Enzyme design. Structure first.
Site, PDB file in Angstrom:
ATOM      1  N   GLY A 105       4.539   3.164  37.756  1.00  0.00           N
ATOM      2  CA  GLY A 105       3.728   2.211  38.829  1.00  0.00           C
ATOM      3  C   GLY A 105       4.182   2.619  40.203  1.00  0.00           C
ATOM      4  O   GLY A 105       5.006   3.735  40.381  1.00  0.00           O
ATOM      5  N   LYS A 106       3.936   1.993  41.255  1.00  0.00           N
ATOM      6  CA  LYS A 106       4.262   2.036  42.666  1.00  0.00           C
ATOM      7  C   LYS A 106       5.741   2.267  42.902  1.00  0.00           C
ATOM      8  O   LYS A 106       6.389   3.018  43.312  1.00  0.00           O
ATOM      9  CB  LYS A 106       3.695   1.065  43.443  1.00  0.00           C
ATOM     10  N   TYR A 107       6.561   1.251  41.882  1.00  0.00           N
ATOM     11  CA  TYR A 107       7.979   1.145  42.176  1.00  0.00           C
ATOM     12  C   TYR A 107       8.683   0.971  40.629  1.00  0.00           C
ATOM     13  O   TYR A 107       9.762   0.579  40.626  1.00  0.00           O
ATOM     14  CB  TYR A 107       8.290   0.020  43.168  1.00  0.00           C
ATOM     15  CG  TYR A 107       7.071  -0.851  43.578  1.00  0.00           C
ATOM     16  CD1 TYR A 107       6.339  -1.786  42.757  1.00  0.00           C
ATOM     17  CD2 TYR A 107       6.845  -0.910  44.900  1.00  0.00           C
ATOM     18  CE1 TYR A 107       5.588  -2.796  43.000  1.00  0.00           C
ATOM     19  CE2 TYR A 107       5.917  -1.691  45.434  1.00  0.00           C
ATOM     20  CZ  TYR A 107       5.286  -2.600  44.568  1.00  0.00           C
ATOM     21  OH  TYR A 107       4.176  -3.426  45.060  1.00  0.00           O
ATOM     22  N   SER A 108       8.009   1.603  39.721  1.00  0.00           N
ATOM     23  CA  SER A 108       8.912   1.993  38.389  1.00  0.00           C
ATOM     24  C   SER A 108       8.205   3.053  37.700  1.00  0.00           C
ATOM     25  O   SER A 108       7.123   3.277  37.768  1.00  0.00           O
ATOM     26  CB  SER A 108       9.149   0.485  37.522  1.00  0.00           C
ATOM     27  OG  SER A 108       7.685   0.214  37.377  1.00  0.00           O
TER      28      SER A 108
ATOM     29  N   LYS B 122      12.231  -0.270  31.803  1.00  0.00           N
ATOM     30  CA  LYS B 122      11.734  -0.048  33.105  1.00  0.00           C
ATOM     31  C   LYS B 122      12.840   0.289  34.243  1.00  0.00           C
ATOM     32  O   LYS B 122      13.491  -0.645  34.635  1.00  0.00           O
ATOM     33  CB  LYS B 122      11.019  -1.490  33.682  1.00  0.00           C
ATOM     34  CG  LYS B 122      10.155  -1.585  34.758  1.00  0.00           C
ATOM     35  CD  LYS B 122       9.553  -2.777  35.017  1.00  0.00           C
ATOM     36  CE  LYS B 122       8.513  -2.978  36.173  1.00  0.00           C
ATOM     37  NZ  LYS B 122       7.815  -4.308  36.187  1.00  0.00           N
TER      38      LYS B 122
ATOM     39  N   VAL C 216       8.379   3.439  33.386  1.00  0.00           N
ATOM     40  CA  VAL C 216       8.714   2.918  31.932  1.00  0.00           C
ATOM     41  C   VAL C 216       8.734   3.702  30.813  1.00  0.00           C
ATOM     42  O   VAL C 216       7.940   4.519  30.458  1.00  0.00           O
ATOM     43  CB  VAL C 216       7.699   1.503  31.655  1.00  0.00           C
ATOM     44  CG1 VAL C 216       8.112   1.005  30.440  1.00  0.00           C
ATOM     45  CG2 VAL C 216       7.756   0.511  32.603  1.00  0.00           C
TER      46      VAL C 216
ATOM     47  N   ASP D 137      -1.092 -10.021  39.492  1.00  0.00           N
ATOM     48  CA  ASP D 137      -1.430  -8.536  39.030  1.00  0.00           C
ATOM     49  C   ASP D 137      -2.113  -8.517  37.714  1.00  0.00           C
ATOM     50  O   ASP D 137      -1.916  -7.941  36.865  1.00  0.00           O
ATOM     51  CB  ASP D 137      -0.473  -7.637  39.342  1.00  0.00           C
ATOM     52  CG  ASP D 137      -0.902  -6.266  39.253  1.00  0.00           C
ATOM     53  OD1 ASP D 137      -1.839  -5.835  39.673  1.00  0.00           O
ATOM     54  OD2 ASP D 137       0.096  -5.222  39.074  1.00  0.00           O
TER      55      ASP D 137
ATOM     56  N   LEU E 153       6.032   5.966  28.902  1.00  0.00           N
ATOM     57  CA  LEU E 153       5.054   5.223  28.431  1.00  0.00           C
ATOM     58  C   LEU E 153       4.038   5.216  29.697  1.00  0.00           C
ATOM     59  O   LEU E 153       2.790   4.845  29.599  1.00  0.00           O
ATOM     60  CB  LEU E 153       5.361   3.821  27.919  1.00  0.00           C
ATOM     61  CG  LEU E 153       6.389   3.800  26.446  1.00  0.00           C
ATOM     62  CD1 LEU E 153       6.661   2.376  26.197  1.00  0.00           C
ATOM     63  CD2 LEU E 153       5.173   4.390  25.556  1.00  0.00           C
ATOM     64  N   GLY E 154       4.584   5.011  31.041  1.00  0.00           N
ATOM     65  CA  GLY E 154       3.816   4.781  32.111  1.00  0.00           C
ATOM     66  C   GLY E 154       4.668   4.737  33.270  1.00  0.00           C
ATOM     67  O   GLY E 154       5.812   4.906  33.275  1.00  0.00           O
TER      68      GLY E 154
HETATM   69  C1  LIG Z   1       1.146   1.530  28.514  1.00  0.00           C
HETATM   70  O1  LIG Z   1       1.224   2.081  27.288  1.00  0.00           O
HETATM   71  C2  LIG Z   1       1.789   1.886  26.313  1.00  0.00           C
HETATM   72  C3  LIG Z   1       2.698   0.637  25.980  1.00  0.00           C
HETATM   73  C4  LIG Z   1       3.577   0.404  25.117  1.00  0.00           C
HETATM   74  N1  LIG Z   1       4.507  -0.730  25.026  1.00  0.00           N
HETATM   75  C5  LIG Z   1       4.999  -1.438  25.985  1.00  0.00           C
HETATM   76  N2  LIG Z   1       5.467  -2.613  25.491  1.00  0.00           N
HETATM   77  C6  LIG Z   1       6.277  -3.395  26.388  1.00  0.00           C
HETATM   78  C7  LIG Z   1       6.343  -3.117  27.606  1.00  0.00           C
HETATM   79  C8  LIG Z   1       6.768  -3.882  28.834  1.00  0.00           C
HETATM   80  C9  LIG Z   1       6.167  -2.903  30.036  1.00  0.00           C
HETATM   81  N3  LIG Z   1       5.452  -2.056  29.326  1.00  0.00           N
HETATM   82  C10 LIG Z   1       4.903  -1.008  30.147  1.00  0.00           C
HETATM   83  C11 LIG Z   1       4.725   0.255  29.878  1.00  0.00           C
HETATM   84  C12 LIG Z   1       4.243   1.210  30.659  1.00  0.00           C
HETATM   85  C13 LIG Z   1       3.767   0.837  31.975  1.00  0.00           C
HETATM   86  C14 LIG Z   1       4.134  -0.217  32.535  1.00  0.00           C
HETATM   87  C15 LIG Z   1       3.738  -0.756  33.664  1.00  0.00           C
HETATM   88  C16 LIG Z   1       4.906  -0.823  34.866  1.00  0.00           C
HETATM   89  C17 LIG Z   1       5.436   0.601  35.027  1.00  0.00           C
HETATM   90  N4  LIG Z   1       5.705   1.575  35.391  1.00  0.00           N
HETATM   91  C18 LIG Z   1       4.516  -1.219  31.691  1.00  0.00           C
HETATM   92  C19 LIG Z   1       5.445  -2.086  28.091  1.00  0.00           C
HETATM   93  N5  LIG Z   1       4.783  -1.197  27.173  1.00  0.00           N
HETATM   94  C20 LIG Z   1       3.286   1.306  23.860  1.00  0.00           C
HETATM   95  C21 LIG Z   1       2.427   2.098  23.848  1.00  0.00           C
HETATM   96  O2  LIG Z   1       2.123   2.905  22.884  1.00  0.00           O
HETATM   97  C22 LIG Z   1       2.416   2.357  21.493  1.00  0.00           C
HETATM   98  C23 LIG Z   1       1.701   2.395  25.112  1.00  0.00           C
HETATM   99  O3  LIG Z   1       0.782   3.551  24.954  1.00  0.00           O
HETATM  100  C24 LIG Z   1      -0.466   3.067  24.869  1.00  0.00           C
HETATM  101 CL   LIG Z   2       6.411  -3.916  33.485  1.00  0.00          CL
END
Ligand SMILES: COc1cc(Nc2ncc3ccn(-c4cccc(CCC#N)c4)c3n2)cc(OC)c1OC
Ligand SMILES: [Cl-]
Ligand SMILES: [Cl-]
Length: 329
Positions: free
Chosen positions: A43-46, A63, A48, A151, A40-41
């Protein structure tokens, strides 16, 4: 010196266990209980991952924490435990390790998030008021619990636009507020850094989050995202000064006895304080109101002590439509 106007003594009034995160001992479960589905994404130190819990078929997020001091991990975990059940705070479900790598990971509730770059451009006036009110609830809660997020930015606000559910995420930079403590200014993300960070003023507080929130509000109502688009940390302050003016900046620095890095001498120049109405145009006019501009003017202030608190902001007229709509037809 500087002290928060609200919640200053929260932590000193609590048991030491509450804020002494170094003494916290998480219990690490088995990450094999979770099937990773997709990234899903990062960061600098994780990084997810979306995952399914194999035992109960719950969709969650995992995470995986990149190499850091055990101390930073304890801080995030203890903070999440202290905030659990709080309004619009992401729910930490479990703390786990992969048996092979031994790598620690945090499991959170999944939010069916719409990317802010898609969402913000379809929000109505009311929708912006509604979601900003939800985010304020999260900030008033964490501040009341003695915690600065440090943040706040769109990337850290998950919104399910069907369920109308908002969660503030990524507590990895969050910290306990202790009066007179000097904090590291290398927090927040460039476009959301308060002037205090940019001028190396360490005795900051919860009000940092309120700067960041004002930056989000400005981008949402004016559709200029990010609102203050610095090329680097020096240029970030110049972009702020082009709006808030230089006289008020110099006033702030004198008030708190802040020595300005001389590299600013040749780039800040001299700027008037602008009318917020200057940012209105035909494509954003429907999102702007006198109330929105008054709120923005009271959040985006150099002087951190003068910014509205999260609760003061919630009480602002801009949110009257939201407060009224909380009683359904
Ligand atoms: C962010 O995108 C999407 C995120 C989500 N849902 C989602 N629900 C709960 C959390 C808790 C941390 N995260 C997260 C995800 C990615 C990055 C980070 C930052 C820390 C790191 N690495 C936190 C979460 N993301 C669904 C999607 O789709 C349904 C997305 O896509 C749009
Ligand atoms: Cl997070
Ligand atoms: Cl008003």
């Amino acid at each position: 010196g500087s002290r928060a106007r609200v919640y200053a003594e929260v932590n000193s009034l609590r048991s030491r266990e509450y804020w002494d995160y170094e003494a916290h001992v998480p219990s690490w479960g088995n990450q094999d209980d979770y099937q990773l589905v997709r990234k899903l994404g990062r960061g600098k130190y994780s990084e997810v991952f979306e995952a399914i819990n194999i035992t109960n078929n719950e969709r969650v997020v995992v995470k995986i924490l990149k190499p850091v001091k055990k101390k930073k991990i304890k801080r995030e975990v203890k903070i999440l435990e202290n905030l659990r059940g709080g309004t619009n705070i992401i729910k930490l479900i479990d703390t786990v390790k992969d048996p092979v790598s031994k790598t620690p990971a945090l499991v959170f509730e999944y939010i069916n998030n719409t990317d802010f770059k898609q969402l913000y451009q379809i929000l109505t006036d009311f929708d912006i008021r509604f979601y900003m009110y939800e985010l304020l609830k999260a900030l008033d809660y964490c501040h009341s619990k003695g915690i600065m997020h440090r943040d706040v930015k769109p990337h850290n606000v998950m919104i399910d636009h069907q369920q109308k559910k908002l969660r503030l995420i990524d507590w990895g930079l969050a910290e306990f507020y202790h009066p007179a403590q000097e904090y590291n200014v290398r927090v927040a993300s460039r476009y959301f850094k308060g002037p205090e960070l940019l001028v190396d003023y360490q005795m900051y507080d919860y009000s940092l989050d309120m700067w960041s929130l004002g930056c989000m509000l400005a981008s949402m109502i004016f559709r200029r995202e990010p609102f203050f688009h610095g090329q680097d940390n020096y240029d970030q302050l110049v972009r702020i000064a082009k709006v808030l003016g230089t006289e008020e900046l110099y006033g702030y620095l004198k008030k708190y006895h802040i020595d300005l890095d001389p590299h600013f001498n040749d780039i800040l120049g001299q700027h008037s304080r602008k009318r917020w109405e200057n940012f209105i145009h035909s494509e954003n006019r429907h999102l702007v109101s006198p109330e929105a501009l008054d709120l923005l003017d009271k959040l985006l202030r150099y002087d951190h002590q003068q910014r509205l608190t999260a609760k003061e902001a919630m009480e602002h007229p801009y949110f009257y439509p939201v407060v009224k709509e909380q009683s359904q037809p």
